[PDB]
Amino acid sequence: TGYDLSNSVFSPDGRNFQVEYAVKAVENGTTSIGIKCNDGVVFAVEKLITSKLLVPQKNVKIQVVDRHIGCVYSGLIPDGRHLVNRGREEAASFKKLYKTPIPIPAFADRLGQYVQAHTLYNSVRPFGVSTIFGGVDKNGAHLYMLEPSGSYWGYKGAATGKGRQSAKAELEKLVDHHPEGLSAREAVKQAAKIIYLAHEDNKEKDFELEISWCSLSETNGLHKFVKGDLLQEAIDFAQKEIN
Amino acid sequence: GSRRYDSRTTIFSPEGRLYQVEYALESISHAGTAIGIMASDGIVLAAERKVTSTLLEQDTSTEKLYKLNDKIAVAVAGLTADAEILINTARIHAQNYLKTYNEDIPVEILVRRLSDIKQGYTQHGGLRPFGVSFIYAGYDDRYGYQLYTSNPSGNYTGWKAISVGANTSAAQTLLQMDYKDDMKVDDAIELALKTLSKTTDSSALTYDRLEFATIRKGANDGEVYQKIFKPQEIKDILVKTGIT
Amino acid sequence: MTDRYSFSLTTFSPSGKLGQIDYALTAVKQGVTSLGIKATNGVVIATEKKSSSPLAMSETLSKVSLLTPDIGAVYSGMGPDYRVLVDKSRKVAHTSYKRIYGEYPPTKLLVSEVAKIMQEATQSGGVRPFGVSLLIAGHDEFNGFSLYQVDPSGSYFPWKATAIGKGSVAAKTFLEKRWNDELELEDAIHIALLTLKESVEGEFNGDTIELAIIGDENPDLLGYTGIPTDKGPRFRKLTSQEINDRLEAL
Amino acid sequence: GYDRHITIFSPEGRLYQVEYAFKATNQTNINSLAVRGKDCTVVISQKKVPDKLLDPTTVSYIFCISRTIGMVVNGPIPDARNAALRAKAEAAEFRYKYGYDMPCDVLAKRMANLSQIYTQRAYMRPLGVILTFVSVDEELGPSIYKTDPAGYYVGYKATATGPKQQEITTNLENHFKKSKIDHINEESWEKVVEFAITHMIDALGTEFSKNDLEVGVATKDKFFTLSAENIEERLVAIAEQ
Amino acid sequence: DRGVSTFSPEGRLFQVEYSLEAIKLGSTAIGIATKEGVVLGVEKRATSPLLESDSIEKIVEIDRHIGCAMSGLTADARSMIEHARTAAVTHNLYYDEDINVESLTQSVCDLALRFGELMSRPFGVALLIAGHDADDGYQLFHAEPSGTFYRYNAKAIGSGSEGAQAELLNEWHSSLTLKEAELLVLKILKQVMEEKLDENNAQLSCITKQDGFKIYDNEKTAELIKELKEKEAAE
Amino acid sequence: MDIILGIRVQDSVILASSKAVTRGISVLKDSDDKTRQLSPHTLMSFAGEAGDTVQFAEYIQANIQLYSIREDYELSPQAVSSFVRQELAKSIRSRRPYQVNVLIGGYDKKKNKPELYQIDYLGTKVELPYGAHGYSGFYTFSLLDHHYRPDMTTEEGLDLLKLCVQELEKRMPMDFKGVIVKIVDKDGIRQVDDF
Amino acid sequence: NNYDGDTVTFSPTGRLFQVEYALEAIKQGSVTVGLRSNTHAVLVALKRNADELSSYQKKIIKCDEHMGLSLAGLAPDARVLSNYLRQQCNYSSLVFNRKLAVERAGHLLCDKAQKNTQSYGGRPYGVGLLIIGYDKSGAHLLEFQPSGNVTELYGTAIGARSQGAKTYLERTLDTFIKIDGNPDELIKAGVEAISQSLRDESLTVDNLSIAIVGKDTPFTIYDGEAVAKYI
Amino acid sequence: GYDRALSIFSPDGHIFQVEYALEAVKRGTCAVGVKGKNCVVLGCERRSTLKLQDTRITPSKVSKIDSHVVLSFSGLNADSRILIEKARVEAQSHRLTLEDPVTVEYLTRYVAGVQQRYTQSGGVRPFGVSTLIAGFDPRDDEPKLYQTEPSGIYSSWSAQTIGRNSKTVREFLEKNYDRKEPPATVEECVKLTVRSLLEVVQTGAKNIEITVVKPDSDIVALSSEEINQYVTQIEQEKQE
Amino acid sequence: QFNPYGDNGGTILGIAGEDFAVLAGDTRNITDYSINSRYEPKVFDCGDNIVMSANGFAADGDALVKRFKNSVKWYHFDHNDKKLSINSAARNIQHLLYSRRFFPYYVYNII
Ligand SMILES: [Cl-]
Ligand SMILES: [Mg+2]
Ligand SMILES: [Mg+2]
Ligand SMILES: [Mg+2]
């Protein structure tokens, strides 16, 4: 034993226990989701209201990269911010050299390689976040989810955090009941519902809903936050479904 | 991080000793015995090769005695590979001195330089020391014929006669007994071989298990000659002294 | 990041042993048998091509490697370590000799350079020793033919004949009885094949044995004509057919 | 017992971290196979999409390293992509410096040397992957070269990698024992792919749908992967005889 | 082993806390600030009678208006004094003025936590920095290896510190004269010292606006010791 | 600076160096000693560009004094001259070379012989019976070529030097304000206080 | 236990103990309170002394004309982080002729603290900060933890016994938020809030430290007889 | 680079590496320093376990740093060479930049500073050496004698000893050396230095080295016969 | 060839009274024979009751003033809001100017 004390050490299983311990920090965090729609993507996140003293709508969790990519994550919030800062550097250097905005699959690998690099040495700690991200590019809509190991895949729907099982089950129903696809405005409504349904796992404290989206028709392929009437419409739809 | 796996090669024990230096000296004590004897008219270097084989090519082999320049040679005791790293450094240092001052390097200066390098590995860098002890045999116009030794601690001292490697305790007692100040090279040759013959762990001392060298003013007029003995020449001097 | 292992991983133990070098030698012991024999007019080096799978093409894996036109090498121990040492040995023959003196290094000095590289892996920070013992055969104008062994410690010794790896103890005994100072190259090849058969279990033929020589100059292998002084490489790898021919007269 | 944590020798002369990297290779529970035709080199690999939420088009362990070279990986995807990116960079650098396309075997050697360094240098860990490089080389013809965490590499007539590699290996061994040749004597690559799939079915004892497989094909001057519909056409031809 | 910059479960840096234990083993140093000046005094503590006590330099000048006394591993203080002198002197170059005592102390304390794996460990010495400037007047600071500095009306550091600090608690008042402060340092030093206090094993110093920083002669201190003995025998 | 002469006689080396320091149209000093004692039996005179001269001389002096302390032994004039030459040959290909010419006069106590070395700023070393730097030799070499013997006494060397100086004072347009003369022999280095 | 030797090591439950130990240093530190209205933002700090001869350690540091913070924990770490803020506020002014947004100031502190939690050799910061400021979007109050987490709040408190003041502010939320155009009443609410964290000792003239920033009010610190008004 | 912190504090406030360096000094051969009215004498022990030694070429225990200052030591011999070399370089550097030779106090302060630097620098261990530095300042006739140690502290001494059995010879010096009237002549100073070593040395043959330093760069090392005459006279007076 | 310097004209004037001081300057900015601005302020309130004007090459003048204003700001941070005396400011400005001895600020400064 002692194989779990140092990062980048293979156990006799062939496992990196430090990365698996980083996953525990992710599982401890709040619920965040991603939904791929007809011409874009929708992101949503659970924000726990620890106290009345928290200013509503101020502690924003979802982050934009470039102008067409949205990022959300669960786990250690600072680790996510560090990863997004890198993502912004990667996106900037890509656009600087190649002119065109970074494609989503290209961007996904830039993060993937960076996260994976933090599993190669004992002088660094793995990332304590799973990151759901995506957007619209020349080839259409893309949704990705990235784990502490550096592993990532493309998704129809994605979920992570404490309420991931509940969320995943709800996402699986949408995939089955909508093979032809889901609209952007529908996906926002469904996203709100899923976060509310996933809140049963964090039911002690009340929460605040935060949604964003990229859509070719609704947002011109740019990342925007869901605000005002459209946000309230999604909250009302979500509240109606739980009752 | 990496700290976990660091042996810390450059630290004191509670008793004020350097662990790695002491353990390096323990390694050297299992190496083949090397002897140096200084006479009025020259210096002798004798050394024992370790358990050889009949299929070893002796005439082209060199594990003990090395040439630093025309005036200075060394006998090695310890890790041969480590010694060659230091030997090449010493050869370069001697040439640097010759280029700078247009004079052959004084023996002590060369010895001090190598000893300072060894010292550095005991105080900084986190690396293991060189597991090597040298006997330096040399000549210059200041002090004449000189014998020195250096060990992994980087400490060096001058000698009239000295041994390094295995059985130095026994060897030094025998040298202290039969050595005299008015001694000559031919007598010193005999003393060196007789001392090895009594201290050796082998059954009998033969030509194929020895390396031998002399530094003599026995060169035509005021100058010094280095003689690295050939296998046949070692065989002859063994018969002459009456060992085989 | 940064390589933070700036300290030695090989250190002296209380008994004076350098553990990692001893353990490297143990890895060499487990390795497949290889040998070398020096003749009056040449040198031979040989080893078994231990194929990991019959689907694998064992011709693509070369255990015997050309370092210079007149110097060759074979090993026992860890194959990947040998491969990188050959790459470095080839390069150091140019950078530290040929680009200075306009000619290829003599065997003993190339061996010295390889030995230096292996010693540094025994003392430098954040590395383990190489897990191989090399047998380097070669020829040069002023020293003639020669055969050297190089160990993980960096120590090297010249040999008339020797063997390393799995069945080295038995093989060295076999060579002591057969070797003399009047051997011709063909006699040395014959003795090499006899010695190697004892350590091999399975198939024993030109396809499972790798054997090369340092002998006469090969002008047919030079690739050009017109310069009298350039007479071609002395290193030659024997073909599968050439080995089988000598196994009939065995 | 820190000799099992970093890449230094154990008393037995072993490198445990290298051995444990070999075990990580099978973590994906995927089996791959590679064979050579007359004019082509084919590589097939099992494809497993357990989650319905995954986009199956993005799930892949086959990589297009250069126009001529393809690479299939056996091991976790992060290390797989790490190796893939490096091989792509190396293949491109080679062409720029030396004025011709990097051969399959040379790339394999280069990646194997990089792997060797990780077994010798302490601060770098080995990658828990086995890399199978395939191409139709302009000098050597159809080529298969495989690299592992020990830094070992060798050319192959055919090969297999994964948990059930032995069953596939023996199946292929027995075929080449009959035919007494170093390749699949077939003109079209389509039929060489059919051979590869058929012999994997026989060896593993499982049937395959179009979404269960992943296929890569190397021809002269290009390497390409097959779509699900291209594989379906391949599965239909197998069933009809 | 363990990191040099490691936190304990209680939220303290191990190495900083351990360096404080080294300072407790050091010789006593006392400082008293008044409106007429600041007095600095130290226990010399010679290890042998053959040691020429006048070479023991535990009270030191930083600038004309700033003095300094030390306690603990005194060898570690030399680079701190050097930095302080350079800082005081450099500020005079850049701003054509004397440097504030607090600013000087802050500059010295910035070095404190510059250790890791920069220097390999914290300083094993505490400093009493006394001085005067036009803005805040006569001041006394206590600079620790934690990087923290407190201003004090009076302060004792070293082996007899907690005993001396309790005595300074009762004796100090805002109307103390310079002469009264001098005797008070001598009184408390004599109380906590192992050997008998005299002009050779103890040293006084002060900083005034007029005369600046001055280390007292052994003849001058001897008279103050004799003046102390008589006033204690007076009641 | 301007004129530096050197002459090796039977049992000593004599160095004569001008006293004047000039900055443009003004003579700043008329009693400047353009020499440094490198070791008890080795003296180096020097001339070249301002600053470089003294910086180089004192740098050499410090290195030789360091060697003496380390080994408890005085280097031979030949060893010193070789060390100096290497420093100048190193300097000439540097970013800003030392613009200094030197004469090294020493008495070798081992060989019991005086020795004079001439080294210019390029690192051009030559052992000589007599030598000069700059425009000095142009006037003096004809007299030295005529009158010089290797068996000359120190007094005869000084008389020949006075003649060389008299010729300089007659035909040189520049006033160099006389010379400081120093003798290097077995007993060490001394200055001739009347010349 | 075995996983608290350095900052680069997760525990089996996914915890970073060195960061948690750095968090513990804040709890040992003296109490400090932060609160704001729509027009002003206020810091109130209880300063701590070594003994009766000693001075009371300063808790509040100015970063710019429109921004500053109060500290709780290792003071030297606050000096490092406040110096960084001073430079960032200053970079924004010199380059962009722009006053640094308080939200962006929080993001910069978060990222600076994070680098110290993921790399070997270094250590986390051992201090908590309460940043107040007035920018183009009005008054702001931030809470900084050395884990990297930064939070925008109406009010809060950190340090020893800070739970008492935090509960008070949670009750008073609706009242003190409405205190617009009245600095003295907002400070009164802050002084009354910090009083809920006191035991044995009370607020004296050299004990209390107050700071304020607002619409037409530069960041200013009040100490000594200047805070006697609020005792 | 190797940055490891080797010299660190322990729970009880000790730096063990520095304290273990003092143990290396305790093992070293005895060295003694005595200053008279117009001179300073440095005495050194030579262990007689090593015979067949060449005393011409063997590194002497007392080293000249400049023409007017000397340095002797106790502890690791190899370590001492590094300090001596640094000291010699600094002595020439001081003459080169300030046009004056170093004072004895300055040279001591430099050497002590080097020793201290090696107690809080990464990747290095402390010097296992304590030194006695003696001499006369330029144009001064007051004798100077200083001591340094691995921690980096230094101080001035009327008389002092370091190395093995230094406790015993310090005991002797404390009762025999009078401050009000120090050794008025060279003879009296050398005699007292030899006497002090005879408490520890064993045989008074080739085991005692003596070096006398006088004002104005007048340094000389005594020979075996000259020292043997002191050894003879001391014991003949003792037989009473 | 690129010339990094220019001449923006202008003239400034400082007079010291018994208990007051004035710093005047024209508001014209020019290149060659053209007018850039008829009102471009050249004299600035730098804080601590100090006024400053760097006349000559406007780009260098603006940079110096900007740096000195910054120096005043950091003097307050580092020295407990102490007022920067005029003599201390002058010495500070010397070091700002000489920090570019080998690529000077082409301005004549008055405070
Ligand atoms: Cl390579
Ligand atoms: Mg090796
Ligand atoms: Mg490794
Ligand atoms: Mg010339």
Q: What is the 3-state secondary structure (H, E, C) of chain E?
A: CCCCCCECCCCCEHHHHHHHHHHHCCCCEEEEECCCCEEEEEECCCCCCCECHHHCCCEEEEECCEEEEEEECHHHHHHHHHHHHHHHHHHHHHHCCCCCHHHHHHHHHHHHCCECCCECCCCCEEEEEEEEECCCEEEEEEECCCCCEEEECEEEECCCHHHHHHHHHHHCCCCCCHHHHHHHHHHHHHHHCCCCCCCCCEEEEEEECCCEEEECCHHHHHHHHHHHHHHHHCC
**Cα–Cα distance, F147 to F156 (Å, whole number):** 10
- Structure token digits, residue H82: 């590094």
The letter for the amino acid at G143 is: E
CA atoms within 13 A on the CB side of B86: 35
Question: Bridge-partner residues for H208, per DSSP?
Answer: H45
Q: Are C12 and C52 in contact, with CB atoms under 8 Å apart?
A: no
Domains and CATH numbers, chain H: 1-240 (3.60.20.10)
Q: Are C160 and B55 in contact, with CB atoms under 8 Å apart?
A: yes
**Cα–Cα distance, G194 to G155 (Å, whole number):** 12
**Cα–Cα distance, I64 to A2 (Å, whole number):** 60
CA atoms within 13 A on the CB side of H93: 9
Neighbours of ion ligand 4 (CB under 5 A): F 118, 120, 124
- Smallest Cβ distance to B55: which of C16, C153, C176? C176
The letter for the amino acid at C55 is: L
Name every chain D residue with its beta carbon within 8 A of the beta carbon of B2: 122-123
Q: What are phi and psi of D237, to 5 degrees?
A: -65, -35
Question: Bridge-partner residues for H217, per DSSP?
Answer: none
Contacts for A88 with CB less than 8 Å, ≥ 6 apart: A65, A66
Distances from the Cα of B180 to the Cαs of A103, A177, B37, B164, C40, in angstroms?
Answer: 89, 108, 11, 20, 48
**Cα–Cα distance, E102 to E139 (Å, whole number):** 8
From ligand 4's centre to the CA of F105, what distance in Å?
14
Instruction: Give CA I92 to chain center in angstroms.
Output: 12
Q: Are F14 and F161 in contact, with CB atoms under 8 Å apart?
A: yes
CB atoms closer than 10 angstroms to residue B53:
15
**Cα–Cα distance, E189 to E171 (Å, whole number):** 14
Select from E90, E93, E96, E108 the residue whose CB has the most chain I CBs within 10 Å, as the one to mutate to test that interface. E96
Segment (H or E) for A167: helix A164-177
How does strand B42-48 pair with strand B34-39? antiparallel
Q: D151's torsion region: left (phi>0), alpha (psi -120 to 50) or beta?
A: left
Give every strand in the sheet of B144-150, ordered side by side: B65-67, B72-78, B132-140, B144-150, B156-159
Q: Are C142 and C186 in contact, with CB atoms under 8 Å apart?
A: no
**Cα–Cα distance, F8 to F47 (Å, whole number):** 19
A220: helix, strand or coil = coil
Is it the case that chain I and chain C have 3 or more CB pairs lying under 8 Å apart? no
- Residue A150's closest CA among A112, A119, A121? A112
Residues 167-226 of chain C whose Cβ lies under 8 A from any Cβ of chain D: none
Q: Are G27 and G141 in contact, with CB atoms under 8 Å apart?
A: no
Domains and CATH numbers, chain D: 1-241 (3.60.20.10)
**Cα–Cα distance, G102 to G219 (Å, whole number):** 13
CATH number of the domain at C131, please: 3.60.20.10
**Cα–Cα distance, C24 to C132 (Å, whole number):** 7
Does the active-site annotation cover A30?
yes
CB atoms closer than 10 angstroms to residue D222:
14
Between vectors from CA D212 to CA D209 and to CA D215, what angle results, nearest 5°?
105
**Cα–Cα distance, E101 to E91 (Å, whole number):** 12
Segment (H or E) for A207: strand A207-215
* CA-based radius of gyration for chain F: 16
Start-to-end CA span in chain F (Å): 20
Domains and CATH numbers, chain A: 1-243 (3.60.20.10)
H52: helix, strand or coil = coil
DSSP string, chain D: -GGGTSSS--TTS--HHHHHHHHHTTTT---EEEEE-SS-EEEEEE-----TTB-GGG---EEE-SSS-EEEEES-HHHHHHHHHHHHHHHHHHHHHHSSPPPHHHHHHHHHHHHHHHHHBSSSPPPS-EEEEEEEETTTEEEEEEE-TTS-EEEBSEEEESTTHHHHHHHHHHHHHHH-SSS---SSHHHHHHHHHHHHHHHHT----TTTEEEEEEETTEEEEPPHHHHHHHHHHHHT-
Shortest alpha-carbon distance between residue G222 and chain A (Å) = 25
Q: Are B136 and B142 in contact, with CB atoms under 8 Å apart?
A: no
Q: D176: exposed, middle or buried (C-beta count within 10 Å: 0-12, 13-18, 19+)? A: middle
- Residue C160's closest CA among C169, C172, C150, C152? C172
Name every chain B residue with its beta carbon within 8 A of the beta carbon of G8: 1
**Cα–Cα distance, F170 to H34 (Å, whole number):** 63
Question: Bridge-partner residues for H31, per DSSP?
Answer: H44, H162
Domain ranges of chain E: 1-235
Give every strand in the sheet of A152-154, ordered side by side: A63-65, A69-75, A129-137, A140-146, A152-154
**Cα–Cα distance, C136 to D5 (Å, whole number):** 34
Q: Which CATH architecture has domain E1-235?
A: 4-Layer Sandwich (3.60)
Domains and CATH numbers, chain B: 1-244 (3.60.20.10)
Greatest Cα pair distance, chain A, in angstroms, is: 57
How does strand E29-33 pair with strand E154-157? antiparallel
- Structure token digits, residue D126: 């080995």
Q: Are D223 and D216 in contact, with CB atoms under 8 Å apart?
A: yes
**Cα–Cα distance, B77 to D169 (Å, whole number):** 54
Q: Are E4 and E17 in contact, with CB atoms under 8 Å apart?
A: no
CB atoms closer than 10 angstroms to residue D180:
6
Q: Which ligand has the minimum distance to the alpha carbon of residue D124? A: 3
- Structure token digits, residue E59: 């009270």
CATH number of the domain at F10, please: 3.60.20.10
Q: C30: exposed, middle or buried (C-beta count within 10 Å: 0-12, 13-18, 19+)? A: middle
- Residue G98's closest CA among G88, G84, G85? G88
Give 3-state DSSP helix, strand, coil % of chain I, rounded to 5: 30, 30, 40
From ligand 1's centre to the CA of D110, what distance in Å?
5
Q: Name the CATH superfamily for G1-231.
A: Aminohydrolase, N-terminal nucleophile (Ntn) domain (3.60.20.10)
A160: helix, strand or coil = strand
C67: helix, strand or coil = strand
From ligand 4's centre to the CA of F153, what distance in Å?
26
DSSP string, H185-219: SHHHHHHHHHHHHHTTSS-SSSSEEEEEEETTTEE
- Residue A227's closest CA among A241, A243, A211? A211
Q: H217's torsion region: left (phi>0), alpha (psi -120 to 50) or beta?
A: left
Domain that holds residue C69: 1-250
Name every chain F residue with its beta carbon within 8 A of the beta carbon of B99: 86
Q: Going along H105-237, which residue ranges are E strands?
A: 129-135, 144-148, 154-156, 159-162, 208-214, 218-221
Residue pointed to by tokens 């700071």: G211
Method: X-ray
Distances from the Cα of D177 to the Cαs of D174, D181, D182, E160, G152, in angstroms?
Answer: 5, 8, 10, 93, 74
- Residue C149's closest CA among C36, C24, C54? C36
**Cα–Cα distance, B74 to B66 (Å, whole number):** 5
Q: Which ligand has the minimum distance to the alpha carbon of residue D118? A: 3
- Structure token digits, residue D41: 């080199």
The number of domains in chain F is 1
Start-to-end CA span in chain I (Å): 35
**Cα–Cα distance, A151 to D78 (Å, whole number):** 5
Resolution rounded to one decimal, in angstroms? 2.7
- Structure token digits, residue G35: 């609160």
The number of domains in chain C is 1
Contacts for H1 with CB less than 8 Å, ≥ 6 apart: C6, H123
DSSP string, chain F: ---EEEEE-SSEEEEEEE-EEEETTEEEEE----EEEEETTEEEEEEESTTHHHHHHHHHHHHHHHHHHHHTSPPPHHHHHHHHHHHHHHHTTSSS---EEEEEEEEETTTTEEEEEEE-TT--EEEESEEEETTHHHHHHHHHHHH--TT--HHHHHHHHHHHHHHHHHH-SS----EEEEEEETTEEEEES--
HEC per residue, chain G: CCCCCCCCCCCCCCCCHHHHHHHHHHHHCCCEEEEECCCEEEEEEECCECCCCECECCCEEEEECCEEEEEEECHHHHHHHHHHHHHHHHHHHHHHCCCCCHHHHHHHHHHHHHHHHHECCCCCCCEEEEEEEEECCEEEEEEECCCCCEEEECEEEECCCHHHHHHHHHHHHHHHCCCCCCHHHHHHHHHHHHHHHCCCCCCCCCCEEEEEEECCEEEEEECHHHHHHHC
Segment (H or E) for A48: strand A40-48
Instruction: Spell out the alpha helix ranges (H) of B129-206.
Output: 168-178, 185-199
CB atoms closer than 10 angstroms to residue C53:
18
- Structure token digits, residue I86: 């005029």
Q: What are phi and psi of H215, to 5 degrees?
A: -60, 160
B144: helix, strand or coil = strand
Q: Which of A1, A30, A131, A160 is catalytic?
A: A30
Q: Are A30 and A74 in contact, with CB atoms under 8 Å apart?
A: yes
Q: Are H162 and H31 in contact, with CB atoms under 8 Å apart?
A: yes
Between vectors from CA E208 to CA E204 and to CA E209, what angle results, nearest 5°?
165
> Given CB atoms, is B12 within the 8 Å cutoff of chain D?
no
**Cα–Cα distance, B146 to B110 (Å, whole number):** 12
Contacts for H17 with CB less than 8 Å, ≥ 6 apart: B11, B12, H6, H7, H8, H119, H125, H126
How many residues appear in chain B?
A: 244
Contacts for A236 with CB less than 8 Å, ≥ 6 apart: none
Shortest alpha-carbon distance between residue C183 and chain B (Å) = 14
**Cα–Cα distance, C179 to C188 (Å, whole number):** 8
Give every strand in the sheet of C43-48, ordered side by side: C161-164, C34-38, C43-48, C209-214, C235-237
Residue pointed to by tokens 């030899």: H194
Instruction: Give CA F130 to chain center in angstroms.
Output: 10
Start-to-end CA span in chain B (Å): 61
**E109·G4 Cβ contact <8 A:** no
Between vectors from CA H5 to CA H3 and to CA H7, what angle results, nearest 5°?
140
**Cα–Cα distance, G200 to B241 (Å, whole number):** 99
- Structure token digits, residue B100: 């700078």
Distances from the Cα of E228 to the Cαs of E190, E222, F169, in angstroms?
Answer: 10, 10, 80
Q: Going along chain B, which residue ranges are E strands?
A: 34-39, 42-48, 65-67, 72-78, 132-140, 144-150, 156-159, 161-164, 210-216, 225-228
Q: Are E145 and E124 in contact, with CB atoms under 8 Å apart?
A: yes
Contacts for C63 with CB less than 8 Å, ≥ 6 apart: C34, C47, C49, C74, C75, C79, C82, C210
**Cα–Cα distance, F116 to F78 (Å, whole number):** 9
